[model samples]
Target: ESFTIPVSSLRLRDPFILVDKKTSMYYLHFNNNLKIRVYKSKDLSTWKDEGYSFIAKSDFWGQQDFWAPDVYEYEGRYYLFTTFSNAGVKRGTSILVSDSPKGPFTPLVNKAITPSGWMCLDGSLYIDKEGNPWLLFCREWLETIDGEIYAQRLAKDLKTTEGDPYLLFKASEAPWVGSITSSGVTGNVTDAPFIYRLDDGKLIMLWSSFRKTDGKYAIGQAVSASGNVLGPWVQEPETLNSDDGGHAMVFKDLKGRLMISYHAPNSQTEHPVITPIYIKDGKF
Candidate 1:
């Protein structure tokens, strides 16, 4: 079956879809230039603008380059984790809190969870079996030969990191990726690590990379070998090889159907798209 998904005319990257269980609505959040915009949809096919998630003022920690806003509701309050970069400030994932999903989200923390100067982005929230909150995110390749995916525990209140970030995996470890630079760089650079636990108690993470042969960007999953958030994670070998898409996030519909959302082509001219995806036996 074929269906069309609507998107705004403005260029957006790193689309993050949050399914609000209480309201039965899908809130589409994404990075537009240096600001964040949100849209609301009862059904996945149609969308209406809710407004910008939060506009950065001069004093905000994220005065520029606001990217990858992921929202989750915990204990009656909503939290938004995003990546931002500003002059004289740390460049990494930062937290914003809101009482409502369609939020006037305010920054609860002024800095990133990742260490200072770590060049991180695409941070996502994952709550483990024991109800412990964790942040999974990417360390950009611009600062490292191979970009890294890191995970860290969040404090009980979800405002700050509970501990140091752990290097869960790196992009060069994936076999399907190719190096764009001829500097003998390993091509396994991965980004946007989003984690979810299946009903069967399996931990899965979806991430993005580029195919060495065709240069087609795609996403793939890695299962935590020990069935824990931090792993010996194993890749599926075959990625969700879309023609040109990356920086993805996955969520279930109101009816519990799985879907994946991301921008196709990863070019300025291309728009973000959402489509149904199947997850079976920890592979999707």
Candidate 2:
């Protein structure tokens, strides 16, 4: 039994939407308490709560801080890349798998696929032109004051990681990023590294940070100068959105128009927002 709700009434942060072309449905995933709650929609506006798609088991390694879930459908299976954390352990990305888009996903490994020493979050999947899989995740600002995003090679199965991770860029590199003061320490934040390939073969990354002037949460972009994931990436002068909301990704609707989704206000009452993305000459 699912309950229908409007997009405004569905309170969630770090919203990730998977547009399933097969069933003509959209599945939204987000962290809720200790579980990964899911909502399904035939159209973009009206959503049906599919209930908790995943809940940590008694013996699960992750204790709390379940954040941003980026769901991708690879081959015939659905893989969920999200963050998990506990008391002594540093946060990192955990990969889970299920057969359906709406899932009861189980962890692929007992531990996070990211480097053990680094505090990481917001793991998103990026497949290059040659079809090699890459895990793009953020190294928390709490550990590295500058905050960084890295791209690591993932095994074809998407279960294990391959070689060393490449440093994509740092939050401070973007001119629009502002320093965030936490517990008397100032540092820049890096969140949600999502990749979208434009029609002209240009790769643009959508990432989140605060503004320099008013410290407003904003979504910005970085283009791959070499036309691939690894760079020499160049940060765009203008930010995509800066209305105290961010952590966003892009997907095409049933009509084949590009759409972007993110949470608003950057507050407790945050709700998922979907808007038509207009690209002028392959830029956001």
Q: What is the C-alpha lDDT of each candidate?
A: 0.79, 0.87
Q: Per-residue lDDT for 1-284 in model 2, tens only?
A: 35468887988898888999876789998888878999999877888988788888876677687888889988878888878988777899899998889998998886788888899999899888777889999998988899999998899998889889889999999999989999667999999999988766789899999999788888999987567788778898778876788999999988898999998879867888899998776678
Could you report the Cα RMSD, in angstroms, for every candidate shown?
3.3, 1.4
TM-score of 2: 0.96
**Top candidate (lDDT):** 2
Q: Write the per-residue lDDT of candidate 1 for residues 57-125, one digit (tens) a residue.
A: 778877877877888888888888888888876678888888888887888876777667787888888
TM-score of each prediction: 0.91, 0.96
Off by over 4 Å in 2: 1-3
Error of 2 at 97 (Å): 0.3
- Candidate 1 differs from the real structure by a C-alpha RMSD in angstroms, to one decimal, of 3.3
Task: Evaluate model 1: give its TM-score.
Answer: 0.91
